[PDB]
């Protein structure tokens, strides 16, 4: 299994480059390419991915023609110019996984055992990581029901090497916030993950909807997830966690006040400060 | 079935429910906690049980609507609250 | 000429054999809203406590 | 009354002038019946005083404080009437809140007699009046302060009250005047007094440090805001 | 016995006795009973020994799961007189092996530490931050759902 | 005498023990502080005599 996938900046913009290049010559949903990476103990780090050619017909759905030695060649080029990098797997700019995804993620199993699909969007979406680290899963299901190859999901994170984080600075150094918690931050940052929390909130429950609608199937499992999570409320009016909070805010007062009244007898001292200079000033020009 | 607030349950309704004896529930609850099926805590003084219940449970398409329009009310408060946070705090915002 | 050689490249032949070339940077959005994604923060960074313990601690300091 | 209630006074005025008005609604206030109000204006008017430029603004105000005060249920300070300037301004108040806190009726009776157009020429003789038919409040006071369960017979006893039921009407009475935070229980006759609580776990500290930081950030903003900076 | 002595649940010396006690002192032709629990004088000892593990193990699985448990069930479960079971509990607590606070006067042994308020609210800002991120995990198996029966 | 913490009640007879909570310096040091600022007030008004 992989328990995490650490996409590096430049997987990013290379993928970024390929939608780019690729939609402004002819028009093409998706896009596929071949993600090159390092294993740790269980963290692969992608580094590094290529373009592969790739037609698809999507009315069909089984039609898709990728390239082997393309591919193959691709490789030992990469490896001739970095050995670190061995296959992990593949990623394509497709917004949504598509029918035909199994078949290409077995043709990349040919080449790497342990595959992981990172479907990179390439639309900004400010709510959410780019990457979607996807495996595949052959299992009984354990619950009576048929099997199938599926998609196992593996977290997926954005990291980044000295070389790249210095080029990462570097470019977006026109529109980066400051490093520090101002306040004018941390009250945006609030407020982002509200509306992070609220756009969760309203995904699970048009997932509910489908699922009492019957749109989609009751899943059996994840659904007792979320009811666990309905049971790690916090339960909050609770007189002792009342009484905690009311101290605890209180204690944060204090020292707010007392921040407060220095802030205050700075102010004034300043003004004073100012004034003298300026009665000084006023009385030694006549 | 507990309104998921007042989680406490009386040693008679569990005594009732269960049908065991006043002091067997002590015991039956233990053995709940024991095997895993509960992660709560029990009293003796009020004879109620803390209940904090970590194993799920399988679903109804009934139970489903109810967990539906109980996140359709989270998620409406948690809006509420953002756009207070949000209207408040816009000089502060940037 | 609103850049400046520098006293190596000068001293290795700037302006003698090689002349400089301003580098422009092309970037543009898409490729500049992936990159803030390096340090994005979750939703939940904005909604974590901290802990009270080191809080308290660090307000007694 | 009407033309303070109608008219709004700037916040930025000068502080003898915020002086003399809260002088001015402290005994438009007590006079109406407002008493808290007035000792808390005429509280704020002594602390705004021109340091030490005006005696006869503090010697009236401090009578005037000294009055509502008592007629409030609370024994004035003994520091004002111990001060230089105000000893002998304030020695027939002195008096009366001795009578008072002593609870002598006749003493009140006698202090009147020797100083009762003095009081007039003051213009407090009417609040002195009501303080004469109102002193039980300060008796009330004090055993509620001491006392947290005390019998109606007792506090009748202890009140020199003719009757326990007269010391429960006069007992509703001051659980409504703001003087006492107790509640009859009539079944067996014992004023039980609130069960104190920890005020720091309650709201009211948050409340008392928001005020307080209001008022810093406040000043900060209006000491910054001038900031008198000259013309280049 | 030994898997009993490991399960986390109560074990009563009075049941324990009547199922073990032919089988663990005198045994049978077929239960070659051992000179552990014999009669002898240190038979009878190493007997109330067993008692006092027993107890030990019961009164270890209330601190673990009861927060207050009245004198009266405490020495019911035990098996032993109410100041027997004071008694033995404040040894144990006079020692360290176990916190308990013995309120005399109601009978109550209550179990849970005192809670401070740091603590309180970290648990509450732990439950919290648990539930945020079983929501994302759950959101990304509702999309994986979503994607999979288009 | 600041010995076993407690407190007795005659009323009906028992030895309270409690932890006594430690004092949270946090407190001590914000009244430090506010005599301190209190005293620089004083020295404000020291100056500002000259207008």
Known sequence: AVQKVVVHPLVLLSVVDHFNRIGKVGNQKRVVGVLLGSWQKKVLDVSNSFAVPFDEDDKDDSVWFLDHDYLENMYGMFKKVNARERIVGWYHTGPKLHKNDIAINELMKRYCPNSVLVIIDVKPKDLGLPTEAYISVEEVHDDGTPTSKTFEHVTSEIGAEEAEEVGVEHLLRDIKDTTVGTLSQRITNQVHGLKGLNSKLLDIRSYLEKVATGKLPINHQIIYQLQDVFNLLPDVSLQEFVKAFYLKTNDQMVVVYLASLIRSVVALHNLINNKIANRDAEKKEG | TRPANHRQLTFEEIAKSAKITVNEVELLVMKALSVGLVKGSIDEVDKRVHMTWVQPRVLDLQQIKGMKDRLEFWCTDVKSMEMLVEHQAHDILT | ?61 | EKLVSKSVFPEQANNNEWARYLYYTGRIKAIQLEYSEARRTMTNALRKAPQHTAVGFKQTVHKLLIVVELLLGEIPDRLQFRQPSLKRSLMPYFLLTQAVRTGNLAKFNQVLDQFGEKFQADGTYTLIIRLRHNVIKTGVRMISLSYSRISLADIAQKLQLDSPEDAEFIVAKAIRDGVIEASINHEKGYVQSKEMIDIYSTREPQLAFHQRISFCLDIHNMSVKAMRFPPK | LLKLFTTMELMRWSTLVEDYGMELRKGSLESPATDVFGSTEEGEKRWKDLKNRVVEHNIRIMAKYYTRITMKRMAQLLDLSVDESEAFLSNLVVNKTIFAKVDRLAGIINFQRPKDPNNLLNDWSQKLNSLMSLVNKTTHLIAKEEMIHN | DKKFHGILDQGEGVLIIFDEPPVDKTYEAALETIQNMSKVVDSLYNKAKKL
Not at chain 3, 11 to 39: C, P
Not at chain 3, 41 to 52: C, F
Request: glycine share 4%.
């Open chain 3, 1 to 61: 000429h609103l850049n400046k050689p520098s006293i190596q490249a000068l001293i290795h032949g700037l302006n003698r054999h090689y002349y400089s070339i301003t580098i422009n940077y092309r970037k543009n959005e898409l490729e500049q809203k992936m990159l803030l994604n390096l340090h994005k923060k979750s939703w939940m960074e904005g909604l974590t406590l901290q802990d009270y313990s080191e809080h308290c601690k660090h307000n007694e300091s």
